[PDB]
Ligand SMILES: Nc1ncnc2c1ncn2[C@@H]1O[C@H](COP(=O)(O)OP(=O)(O)O)[C@@H](O)[C@H]1O
């Protein structure tokens with residue numbers, strides 16, 4: 467019956483915002499490698515929505531060149547007059563982006579070319595801004611250090627989020643007005659399976675729409691039917 | 702008038718033999734990077750002459766492949782029936798060389814390919830023998846560690862010989878029957894200039910042949926004329 471809230475502040479959200487503002491004021495590189503679907507991507511957008519001098523792209527592996535990725539960052543900076551060459555684009559980024567005290571957020575940092583991440587790290591360095599890397603744990607695996615040596619020397623605050631915590635789903639249940647202890651344990655058990663935040667959010671939205679269509683309150687059995695869907699135990 | 706001695710035991714010779722026997726009994730890798738002409742090449746040959754289960758090649762950059770270098774080591778092992786392919790040669794080295802408790806000495810380790818030194822390190826490891834690297838200080842510079850990471854994990858005893866010592870040239874003067882303190886200081890000053898052992902040996906041999914041709918004893922002025930040759934201050 468109430469409006470579903472899309473985003474909730476969580477212990478991971480608190481941690482990752484402190485890491486984000488750390489790389490902001492620190493003006494240095496923060497790599498966030500974690501298990502898939504730990505909720506990092508969404509929080510980054512909440513940081514972008516709440517804070518000034520913040521930018522974010524995503525990297526599809528289609529846009530995984532230096533040219534394409536810097537073009538993406540340039541259009542995110544609003545310079546629609548960006549040149550299609552590498553060089554003058556790099557110069558335009560260097561003139562535009564330095565002195566703003568900003569924070570670049572880059573998601574899926576595993577698909578970075580060495581020249582790609584190389585130009586990014588030398589950018590932020592020659593720009594006095596923030597760069598923050600996201601994605602899975604292949605990002606730190608791509609460094610483990612003569613090709614990534616000075617970059618491993620840059621690294622300010624890595625934060626690994628493997629899975630959720632109990633206060634994480636507890637604040638989730640607080641935001642979704644969930645009071646059952648059986649409900650809380652079931653939410654925790656759903657959080658034990660991967661795609662944690664996503665599956666939990668899906669399960670929450672299934673139960674909310676089912677209880678709204680039936681005119682009832684979200685309860686434990688709606689959550690059981692929701693989790694009984696999705697083919698999680700079906701190969 | 703006496704016979705010139707070709708080789709003299711020296712503090713560097715003592716140090717480097719202890720490093721050599723260390724990598725022998727240890728059956729592990731010892732990198733000897735030093736200034737050019739520190740006398741390391743000759744001592745290695747004295748170790749080869751005095752000790753059993755010892756082998757040595759040199760690496761010209763002509764023979765700088767895996768195939769050519771392992772062929773050189775194979776002919777040094779006396780297997781003249783060595784195959785001209787990489788694989789069966791590697792197998793023949795693996796069968797021949799394991800169980801002998803030997804010591805391979807490799808000179809000019811700066812011209813090693815990554816596959817070359819790679820096959821050498823995996824050889825000694827799969828062979829329970831000794832490998833010892835020689836040459837200038839570019840050998841350690843080629844490692845400074847994801848391409849050379851496990852190799853930098855192998856390293857047992859690096860010994861850097863930059864220049865000579867005073868007991869070095871003192872034992873040289875003892876072997877060459879030199880008693881002058883002016884002579885000793887002049888020998889030390891010659892040792893301060895690069896190509897130390899080589900120039901000193903050249904100077905010793907110039908003075909010996911000049912004093913033998915003039916029927917006299919080697920003295921300070923013959924050493925001065927010898928050092929006045931060679932165009933050391935002439936560009
Ligand atoms: N605080 C939150 N509240 C609700 N859903 C969240 C929250 N944080 C993340 N999510 C969910 O996580 C997903 C977005 O991030 P996600 O895809 O998990 O990132 P990544 O795949 O990079 O780990 C969406 O399902 C989103 O609803």
Ligand SMILES: Nc1ncnc2c1ncn2[C@@H]1O[C@H](COP(=O)(O)OP(=O)(O)O)[C@@H](O)[C@H]1O
Pocket residue numbers: 707708709710711714736737738739740741742743744836898899900902
């Ligand atoms: N103990 C020694 N006695 C006399 N000459 C020596 C001695 N050790 C080295 N040398 C001289 O050094 C040279 C051989 O080694 P060298 O060429 O200096 O090795 P590297 O070039 O690898 O440093 C020759 O000039 C040799 O006569």
